[PDB]
Tab-separated table of C-alpha atoms in Angstrom:
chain	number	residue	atom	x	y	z
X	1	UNK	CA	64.334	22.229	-4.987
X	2	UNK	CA	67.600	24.281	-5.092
X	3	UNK	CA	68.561	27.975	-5.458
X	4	UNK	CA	67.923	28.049	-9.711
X	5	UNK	CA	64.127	27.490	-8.869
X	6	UNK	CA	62.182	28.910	-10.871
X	7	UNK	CA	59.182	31.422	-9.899
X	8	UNK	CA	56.949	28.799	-10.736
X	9	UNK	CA	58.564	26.243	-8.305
X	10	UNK	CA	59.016	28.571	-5.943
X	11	UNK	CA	55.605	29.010	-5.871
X	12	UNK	CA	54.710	25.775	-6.046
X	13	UNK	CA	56.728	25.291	-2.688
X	14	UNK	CA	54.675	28.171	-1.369
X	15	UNK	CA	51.437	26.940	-1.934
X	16	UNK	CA	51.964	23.587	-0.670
X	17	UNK	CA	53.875	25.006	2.415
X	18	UNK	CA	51.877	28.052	3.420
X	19	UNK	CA	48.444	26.863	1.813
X	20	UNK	CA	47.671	30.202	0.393
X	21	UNK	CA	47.511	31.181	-3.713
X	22	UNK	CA	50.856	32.579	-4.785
X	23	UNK	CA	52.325	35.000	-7.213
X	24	UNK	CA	56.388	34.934	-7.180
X	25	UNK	CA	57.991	37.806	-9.189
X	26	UNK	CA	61.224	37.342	-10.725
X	27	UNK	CA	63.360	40.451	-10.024
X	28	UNK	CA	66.908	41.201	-10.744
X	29	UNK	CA	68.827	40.182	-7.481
X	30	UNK	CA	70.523	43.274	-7.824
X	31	UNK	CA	68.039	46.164	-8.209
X	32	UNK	CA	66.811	48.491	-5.122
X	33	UNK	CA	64.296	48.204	-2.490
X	34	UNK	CA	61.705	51.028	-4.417
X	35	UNK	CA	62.256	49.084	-7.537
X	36	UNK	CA	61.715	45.544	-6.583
X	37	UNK	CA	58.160	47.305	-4.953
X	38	UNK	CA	57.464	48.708	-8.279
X	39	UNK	CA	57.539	45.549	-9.439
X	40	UNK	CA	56.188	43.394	-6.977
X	41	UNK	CA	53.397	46.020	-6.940
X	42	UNK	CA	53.071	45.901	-10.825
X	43	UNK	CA	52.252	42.346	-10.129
X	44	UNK	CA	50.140	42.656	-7.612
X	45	UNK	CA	47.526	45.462	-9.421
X	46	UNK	CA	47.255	42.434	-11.991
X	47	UNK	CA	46.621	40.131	-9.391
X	48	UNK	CA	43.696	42.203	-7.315
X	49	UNK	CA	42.226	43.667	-10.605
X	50	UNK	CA	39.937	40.018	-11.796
X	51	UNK	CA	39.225	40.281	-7.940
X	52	UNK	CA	37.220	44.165	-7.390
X	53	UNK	CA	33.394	43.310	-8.659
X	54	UNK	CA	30.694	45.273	-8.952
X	55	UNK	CA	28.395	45.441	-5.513
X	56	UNK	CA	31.871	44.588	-3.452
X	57	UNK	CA	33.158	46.584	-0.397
X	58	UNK	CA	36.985	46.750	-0.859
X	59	UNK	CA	38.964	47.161	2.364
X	60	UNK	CA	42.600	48.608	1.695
X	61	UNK	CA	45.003	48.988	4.507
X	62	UNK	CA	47.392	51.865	3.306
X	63	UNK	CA	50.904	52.014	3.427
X	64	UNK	CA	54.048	52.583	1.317
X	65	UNK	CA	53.567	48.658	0.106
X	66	UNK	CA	50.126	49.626	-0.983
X	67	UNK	CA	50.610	53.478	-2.243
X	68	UNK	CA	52.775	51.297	-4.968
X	69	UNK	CA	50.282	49.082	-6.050
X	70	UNK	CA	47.834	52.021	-6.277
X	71	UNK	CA	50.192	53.731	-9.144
X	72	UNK	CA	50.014	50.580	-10.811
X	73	UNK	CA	46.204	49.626	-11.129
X	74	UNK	CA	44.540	48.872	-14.560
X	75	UNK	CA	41.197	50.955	-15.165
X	76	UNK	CA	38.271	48.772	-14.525
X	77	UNK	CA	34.667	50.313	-14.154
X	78	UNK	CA	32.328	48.894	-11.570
X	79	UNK	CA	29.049	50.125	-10.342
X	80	UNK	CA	28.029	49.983	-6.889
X	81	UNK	CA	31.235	49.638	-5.376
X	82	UNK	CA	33.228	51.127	-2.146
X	83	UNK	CA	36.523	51.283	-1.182
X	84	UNK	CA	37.570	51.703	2.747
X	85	UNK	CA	39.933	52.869	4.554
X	86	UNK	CA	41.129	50.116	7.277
X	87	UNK	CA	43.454	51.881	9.349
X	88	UNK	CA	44.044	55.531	10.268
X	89	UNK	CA	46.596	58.374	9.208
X	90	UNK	CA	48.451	61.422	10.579
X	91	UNK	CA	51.245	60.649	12.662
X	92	UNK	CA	53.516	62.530	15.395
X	93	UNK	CA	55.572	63.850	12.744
X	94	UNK	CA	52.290	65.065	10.642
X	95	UNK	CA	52.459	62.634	7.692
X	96	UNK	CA	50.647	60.678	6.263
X	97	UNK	CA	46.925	62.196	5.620
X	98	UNK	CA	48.098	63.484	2.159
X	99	UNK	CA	49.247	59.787	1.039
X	100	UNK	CA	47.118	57.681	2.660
X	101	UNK	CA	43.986	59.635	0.810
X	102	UNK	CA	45.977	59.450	-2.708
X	103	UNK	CA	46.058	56.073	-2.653
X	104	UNK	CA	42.468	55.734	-1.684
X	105	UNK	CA	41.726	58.311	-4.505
X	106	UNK	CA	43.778	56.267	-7.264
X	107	UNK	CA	41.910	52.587	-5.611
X	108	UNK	CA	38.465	54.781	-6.260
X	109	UNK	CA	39.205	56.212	-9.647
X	110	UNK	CA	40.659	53.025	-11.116
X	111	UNK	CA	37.212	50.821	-10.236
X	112	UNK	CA	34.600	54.073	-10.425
X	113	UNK	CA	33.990	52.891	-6.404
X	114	UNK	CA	32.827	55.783	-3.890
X	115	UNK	CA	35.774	56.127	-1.721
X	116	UNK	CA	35.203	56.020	2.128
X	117	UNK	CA	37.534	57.221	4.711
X	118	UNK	CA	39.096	56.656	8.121
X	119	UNK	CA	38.270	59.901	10.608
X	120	UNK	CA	41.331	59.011	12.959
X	121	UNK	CA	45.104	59.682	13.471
X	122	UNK	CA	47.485	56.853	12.281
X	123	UNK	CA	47.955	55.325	15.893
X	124	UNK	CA	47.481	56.327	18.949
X	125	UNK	CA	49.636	57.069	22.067
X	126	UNK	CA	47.112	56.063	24.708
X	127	UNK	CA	44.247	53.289	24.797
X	128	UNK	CA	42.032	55.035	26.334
X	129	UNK	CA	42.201	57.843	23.284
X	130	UNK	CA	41.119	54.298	21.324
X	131	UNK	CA	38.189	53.371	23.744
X	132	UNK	CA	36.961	56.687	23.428
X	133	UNK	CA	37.219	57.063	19.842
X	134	UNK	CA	35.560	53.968	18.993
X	135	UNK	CA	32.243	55.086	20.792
X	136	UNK	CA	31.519	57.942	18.276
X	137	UNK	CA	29.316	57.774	15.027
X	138	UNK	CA	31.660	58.884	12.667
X	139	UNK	CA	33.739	56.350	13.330
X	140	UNK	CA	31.521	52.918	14.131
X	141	UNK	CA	30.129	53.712	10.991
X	142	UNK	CA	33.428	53.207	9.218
X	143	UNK	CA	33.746	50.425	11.377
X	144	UNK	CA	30.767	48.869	10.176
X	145	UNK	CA	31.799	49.128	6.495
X	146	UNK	CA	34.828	47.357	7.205
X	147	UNK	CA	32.602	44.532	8.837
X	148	UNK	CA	31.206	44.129	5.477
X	149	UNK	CA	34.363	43.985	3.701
X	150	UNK	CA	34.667	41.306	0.399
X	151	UNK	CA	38.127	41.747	-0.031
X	152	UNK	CA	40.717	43.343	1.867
X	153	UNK	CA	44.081	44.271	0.764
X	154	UNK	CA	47.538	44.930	2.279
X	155	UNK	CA	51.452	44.909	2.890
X	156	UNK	CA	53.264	43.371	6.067
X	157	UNK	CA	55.356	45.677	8.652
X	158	UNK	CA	58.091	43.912	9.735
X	159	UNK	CA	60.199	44.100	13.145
X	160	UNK	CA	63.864	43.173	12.310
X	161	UNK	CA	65.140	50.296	16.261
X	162	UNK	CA	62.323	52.177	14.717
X	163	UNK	CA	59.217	50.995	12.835
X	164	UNK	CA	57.318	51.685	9.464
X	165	UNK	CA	54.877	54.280	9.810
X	166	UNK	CA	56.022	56.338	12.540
X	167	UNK	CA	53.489	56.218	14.341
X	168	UNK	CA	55.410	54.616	17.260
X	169	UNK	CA	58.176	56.027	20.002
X	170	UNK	CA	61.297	54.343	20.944
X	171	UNK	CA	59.330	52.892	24.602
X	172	UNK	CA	57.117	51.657	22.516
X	173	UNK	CA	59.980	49.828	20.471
X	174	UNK	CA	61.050	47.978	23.227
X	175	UNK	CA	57.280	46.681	24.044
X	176	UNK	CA	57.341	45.287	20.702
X	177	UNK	CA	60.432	43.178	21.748
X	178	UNK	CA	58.689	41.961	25.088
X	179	UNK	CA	56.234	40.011	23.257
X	180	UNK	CA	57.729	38.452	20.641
X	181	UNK	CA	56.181	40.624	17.815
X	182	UNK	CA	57.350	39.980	14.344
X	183	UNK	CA	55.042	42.208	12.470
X	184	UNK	CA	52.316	43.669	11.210
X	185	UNK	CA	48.998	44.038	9.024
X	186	UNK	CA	46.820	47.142	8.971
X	187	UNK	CA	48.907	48.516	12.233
X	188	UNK	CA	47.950	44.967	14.213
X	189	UNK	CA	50.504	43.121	15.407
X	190	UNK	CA	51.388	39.457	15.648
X	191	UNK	CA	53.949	37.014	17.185
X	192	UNK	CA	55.817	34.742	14.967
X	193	UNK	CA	53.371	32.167	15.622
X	194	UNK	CA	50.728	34.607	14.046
X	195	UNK	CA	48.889	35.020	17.529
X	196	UNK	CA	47.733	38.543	18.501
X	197	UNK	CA	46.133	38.317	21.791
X	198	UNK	CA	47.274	39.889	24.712
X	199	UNK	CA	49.846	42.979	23.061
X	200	UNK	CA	49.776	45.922	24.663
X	201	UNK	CA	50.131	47.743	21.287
X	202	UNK	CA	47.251	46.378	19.893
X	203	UNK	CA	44.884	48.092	22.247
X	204	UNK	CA	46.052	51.466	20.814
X	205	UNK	CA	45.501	50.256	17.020
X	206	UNK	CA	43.082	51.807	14.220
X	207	UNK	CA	43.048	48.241	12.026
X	208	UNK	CA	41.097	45.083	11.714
X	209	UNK	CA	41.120	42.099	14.462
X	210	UNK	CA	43.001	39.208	12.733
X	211	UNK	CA	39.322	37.636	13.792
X	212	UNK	CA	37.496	40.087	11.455
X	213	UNK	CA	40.660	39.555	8.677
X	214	UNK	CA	40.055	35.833	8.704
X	215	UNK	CA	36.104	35.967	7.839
X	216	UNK	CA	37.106	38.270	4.582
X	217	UNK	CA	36.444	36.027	1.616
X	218	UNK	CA	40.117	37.172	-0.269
X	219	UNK	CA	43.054	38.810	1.460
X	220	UNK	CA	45.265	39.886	-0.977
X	221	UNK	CA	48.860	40.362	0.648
X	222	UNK	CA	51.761	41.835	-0.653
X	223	UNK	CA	55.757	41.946	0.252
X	224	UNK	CA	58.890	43.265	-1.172
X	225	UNK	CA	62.086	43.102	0.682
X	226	UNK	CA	63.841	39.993	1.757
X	227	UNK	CA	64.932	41.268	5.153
X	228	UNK	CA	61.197	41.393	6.183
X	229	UNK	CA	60.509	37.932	6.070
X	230	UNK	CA	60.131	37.647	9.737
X	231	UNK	CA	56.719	39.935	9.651
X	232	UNK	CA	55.397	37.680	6.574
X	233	UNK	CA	56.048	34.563	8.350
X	234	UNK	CA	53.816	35.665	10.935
X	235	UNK	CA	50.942	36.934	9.062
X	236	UNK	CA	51.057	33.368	7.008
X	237	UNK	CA	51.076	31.891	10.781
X	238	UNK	CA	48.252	34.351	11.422
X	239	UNK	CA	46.380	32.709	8.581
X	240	UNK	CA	45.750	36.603	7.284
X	241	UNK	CA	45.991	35.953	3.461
X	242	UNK	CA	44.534	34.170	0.719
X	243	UNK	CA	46.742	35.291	-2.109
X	244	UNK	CA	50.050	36.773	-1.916
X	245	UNK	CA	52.445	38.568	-3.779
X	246	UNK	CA	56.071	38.804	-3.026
X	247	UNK	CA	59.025	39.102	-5.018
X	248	UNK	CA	61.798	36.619	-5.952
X	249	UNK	CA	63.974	37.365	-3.612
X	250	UNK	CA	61.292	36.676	-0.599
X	251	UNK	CA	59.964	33.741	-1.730
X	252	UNK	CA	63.164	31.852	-1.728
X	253	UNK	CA	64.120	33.277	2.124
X	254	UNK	CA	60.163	31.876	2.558
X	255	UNK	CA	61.177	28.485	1.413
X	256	UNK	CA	64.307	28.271	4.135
């Protein structure tokens, strides 16, 4: 082991380290954050397309990480098929609705899988906007599809102040801080020992309970970004993934 590994060894060290499949992607160390996505999400489309069946229920948590892959998906016909939504959009700035279905619509038209959507905001400022929320029809029944999940897919927020998304204040910022949260998946957040109980943020979420997460059959996460591998060392903690995909760059921080 030494810094001229190759991909390969890298993720060789991966997989015995972090006991999850592993797809490194050698990227010039030199080349910008949106282009080391565009490849690591190049990758990743290859990665997730032997993976969407026929009969499945797909579960994509959006984000800028996953509006990538989306672009770079290879057509693949399936019958029977859904993909859903796993965490809200619209934030306090109004973004997000637009881009989050786009992605959904490009996941749908790729596999010929009905598309099913999230009827609620991004985040939200108050837990008991959540409670109430999660009491109406429109929205356990989303819920419930997400239950059923085969697969779920998604990228890694990562806290290094403001956070990806913008879905959160600066109070909020300094909550994060208070317990030890390195990250995120689908807008849930986790310590650096993967743990998720007990943060106060995570009562005003839209996504997934790790719980739920850990019963899918594959989670397919991907990174890009070496400065974010506190978040991803968390989620592996967390036991969220099955597969990843992370560029070159990551996977040797992941190693130290």
């Amino acid at each position: 082991a030494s810094p001229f590994d190759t991909g390969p060894e890298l993720e060789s060290q991966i997989r015995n380290q972090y006991g999850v499949d592993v797809h490194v992607v050698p990227v010039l160390d030199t080349l910008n954050e949106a282009e080391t996505l565009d490849r690591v999400a190049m990758q990743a489309a290859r990665t997730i397309g032997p993976l969407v069946d026929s009969n499945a229920i797909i579960g994509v948590a959006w984000g800028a990480t996953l509006s990538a892959v989306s672009r770079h998906l290879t057509r693949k016909m399936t019958h029977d098929s859904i993909v859903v939504q796993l965490n809200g959009a619209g934030n306090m700035q109004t973004t997000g609705i637009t881009y989050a279905s786009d992605i959904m619509r490009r996941f749908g038209s790729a596999y010929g899988a009905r598309v099913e959507q999230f009827p609620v905001p991004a985040f939200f400022d108050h837990a008991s906007t959540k409670t109430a929320m999660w009491n109406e029809r429109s929205v356990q029944r989303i819920l419930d599809l997400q239950a059923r999940m085969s697969i779920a897919i998604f990228g890694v927020g990562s806290v290094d102040h403001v956070y990806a998304g913008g879905y959160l204040d600066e109070h909020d910022l300094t909550m994060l801080a208070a317990d030890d949260v390195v990250g995120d998946v689908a807008t849930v957040f986790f310590r650096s020992d993967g743990s998720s109980d007990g943060i106060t943020l995570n009562e005003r979420s839209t996504g997934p309970s790790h719980e739920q997460l850990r019963q899918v059959r594959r989670r397919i996460c991907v990174v890009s970004g070496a400065s974010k591998i506190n978040g991803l060392q968390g989620a592996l903690a967390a036991g969220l993934a099955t597969d990843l995909i992370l560029d070159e760059a990551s996977a040797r921080r992941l190693v130290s």
